[PDB]
Structure formats: structure tokens, C-alpha cells
């Protein structure tokens, strides 16, 4: 295989109720922690799974509608409607608090020091630095009105902001995205399911390009877009925009993309679909490297898998699974299975791997 697949944990083995293994109650903001909200009566608890020590979870009583651990530190952000609080778990201490004017419908850590807040009407960034309070970044576009918000993310420089929501229409799930430029102060609505930014240095360019990659299924097929956002740096060639098909077999009529992470090390896009297919795409050309069903159950939450520059996720059955490029196998797979020596050589030179030299 060009990928290594690893089951890390079955959350049901830790006595986690499978009813709470879903998007609204389980979060994984980084590969370091999983938080699960469980409620039986009016007695809500949070289960905090240290992924370096999974047999010893912390169970604490809560009254929060949502719990997201900081990506880098055992610092938990808890909310109840408009009330936001941040606790250092090891110091058992409230470190920050803020009340919003509007209900926060979705929130996510976008860095080790900043939480993104989404209301019905606006997106804010809340820095953990000193007396910093939430700063409004943009107004929500009317095209996302009535969506369930499922993701918010940014480019490395926080100059390009992307809000993603979904709704049911005609028994299919339609994705609505809002791309916002900080510098231009302009939004663009996009029909999109899953997306990520990436930094990519093109051959001969002195500077990295900032790429926007999004995958969508429309009424008549799937598409993946890789687009340079913003003006290319002085002296940089522009990234030629890529647009490629996203294959769904005839049997997967209700399938659509639900997760994307991009390998900074390998310049590959990981795309996961609702029915549990993984797709690998080359970031440079958009070429589909690999497709396979890795899960019978929806992988509903993902994060970068830091140690392997891969993707780690949780499915609705409680399987914690990871996919990365298998560095020993990827070049031979592209050569021998895809019959694409061009892609093999290009990817081998990018990551200094062996076996891309055409032997005759």
C-alpha cells in the first residue's frame, strides 16, 4: 500500500457510551487529546483521553454544551450558549472567561493561542494573550444561512479564512463555504464539502505559494480544486490552478467528502468521505494517488497526525484511526500500480525517497 493504516484505540474499550461518539459530543482538536461529553440525567461529564496514556482517562462533571482542548496544552475551552471559559486542567484553574452577545454555534482552535468563534452572523478570533477579547474577523455570507457549521480554518498567516456548513436538499448534503480575504475585506461563497490551506514551494520559486484546496460533490459528480489564493510573491510563478474529478462508485450514491488534511512533509491531500473512503491526491498536480474504504463508519473528526505528517480521525463506532504516506512503498506504488513514472520521480525528488530512477 502507499499508505500506512493504524487503529490507535477503540473508545468503547475505555467504557465510552457509543451514543456519545459523534460530531456534537466528541472533539479532537489535535492528535494529543480526545474529549467526549456524556450526559445521562442532568449530570453531564467530560471524558478527557490523553492519547499518550489512553487507559487512564479523566472524567470530570461539566455543564458545557461543548468542550475543545487546546492543540498544544492540557487547557480546555468550555461553553454554554454565550458563556466561554478556559481551564488549565493540571492547575484545576479557570484561566480565561468571556460572554458573547450571540450564541456561539461552532468553535475550533486555529492555533496553539487562538480560538475561532462562529455565531449566526459573524466569525471572531479569540487570542489567549493577556486581556485579549474576541475580535470580529468577518460578517457571515447569506449563502451559509440555515447551514450546520462543520469547520472553520485559516492559512498559516491567518490572511485567508474559510467557514464551512452543510444542509440537506433533495436527500443530498450540500456544502456551503465562505472564503474571506483579511487584506481585501471581501468574501466569496463556494459550494464545497471539505477544504484545507497548504504552503507549497514550486520548483524555481524563491517563496512558498499559499494554496486553497477544496473538494465537493455536486448533483452530477465530485471535483477537487487546488488554487493559489492572493497575489503571488514578487518574482514567483503563479501556481497553475488544478481541478480534478473526485470518484464515487455507482453504489455510493449518497457519499460526499467529510474531512481533509494536507501533509506539509509529503505535499499530499488526504480526503475522507462519509461512507469511509480515503483518497490521496498530489498537492502539486492534483493526481489521485490512492482510493480505498478504510472504515465502514463515518470518520466525522480529523486532525494532523504530527509524528507521521498524516491524518488521524475518529469514526462513529469509536475507532481512532490514522493514515500517512508509507515512505517505503509510495514511489514503487506510483511507478508499478499507477504506471506514472513522471509523478514518482517528482514526488521522490520532493521527499528525497529512493526508487524513482527508470531502470530501462
Amino acid at each position: 500500500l502507499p499508505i500506512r493504516f493504524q487503529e490507535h484505540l477503540q473508545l468503547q474499550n475505555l467504557g465510552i457510551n457509543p451514543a456519545n461518539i459523534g460530531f456534537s459530543t466528541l472533539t479532537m482538536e489535535s492528535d494529543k487529546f480526545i474529549c467526549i461529553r456524556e450526559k445521562v440525567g442532568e449530570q453531564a461529564q467530560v471524558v478527557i483521553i490523553d492519547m499518550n496514556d489512553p487507559s487512564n482517562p479523566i472524567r470530570r462533571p461539566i455543564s458545557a454544551d461543548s468542550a475543545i482542548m487546546n492543540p498544544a496544552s492540557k487547557v480546555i475551552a468550555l461553553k454554554a450558549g454565550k458563556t466561554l471559559q478556559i481551564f488549565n486542567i493540571e492547575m484545576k484553574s479557570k484561566m480565561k472567561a468571556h460572554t458573547m452577545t450571540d450564541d456561539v454555534t461552532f468553535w475550533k482552535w486555529i492555533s496553539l493561542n487562538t480560538v475561532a468563534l462562529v455565531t449566526d452572523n459573524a466569525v471572531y478570533h479569540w487570542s489567549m494573550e493577556g486581556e485579549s477579547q474576541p475580535v470580529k474577523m468577518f460578517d457571515r455570507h447569506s449563502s451559509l444561512a440555515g447551514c450546520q457549521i462543520i469547520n472553520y480554518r485559516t492559512d498559516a498567516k491567518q490572511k485567508w479564512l474559510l467557514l464551512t456548513g452543510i444542509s440537506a436538499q433533495q436527500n443530498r448534503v450540500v456544502g456551503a463555504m465562505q472564503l474571506y480575504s483579511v487584506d481585501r475585506k471581501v468574501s466569496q461563497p463556494i459550494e464545497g464539502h471539505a477544504a484545507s490551506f497548504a504552503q507549497f514551494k514550486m520548483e524555481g520559486n524563491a517563496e512558498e505559494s499559499t494554496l486553497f484546496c477544496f473538494a465537493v460533490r455536486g448533483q452530477a459528480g465530485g471535483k477537487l480544486h487546488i488554487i493559489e489564493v492572493g497575489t503571488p510573491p514578487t518574482g514567483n510563478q503563479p501556481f497553475p490552478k488544478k481541478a480534478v474529478d473526485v470518484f464515487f462508485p455507482p453504489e455510493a450514491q449518497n457519499d460526499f467528502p467529510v474531512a481533509m488534511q494536507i501533509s506539509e512533509k509529503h505535499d499530499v491531500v488526504f480526503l475522507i468521505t462519509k461512507y469511509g473512503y480515503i483518497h490521496l491526491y498530489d498537492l502539486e498536480t492534483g493526481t489521485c494517488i490512492y482510493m480505498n474504504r478504510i472504515s465502514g463508519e463515518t470518520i466525522f473528526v480529523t486532525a494532523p497526525h504530527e509524528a507521521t505528517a498524516g491524518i488521524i480521525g475518529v469514526n462513529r463506532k469509536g475507532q481512532v484511526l490514522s493514515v500517512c504516506v508509507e515512505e517505503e512503498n509510495i514511489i514503487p506504488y506510483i511507478t508499478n500500480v499507477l504506471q506514472n513514472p513522471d509523478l514518482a520521480l517528482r514526488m521522490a525528488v520532493r521527499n528525497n525517497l529512493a526508487g524513482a530512477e527508470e531502470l530501462f
Partner: peptide, 11 residues
């Protein structure tokens, strides 16, 4: 306080 989580005592 009106805290959204409680912790076990320090002893």
C-alpha cells in the same frame, strides 16, 4: 464560581 467544569480537591 459558576464554572463549566469542577475538579477533585487538592487535599
Amino acid at each position: 464560581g459558576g464554572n463549566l467544569i469542577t475538579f477533585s480537591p487538592l487535599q
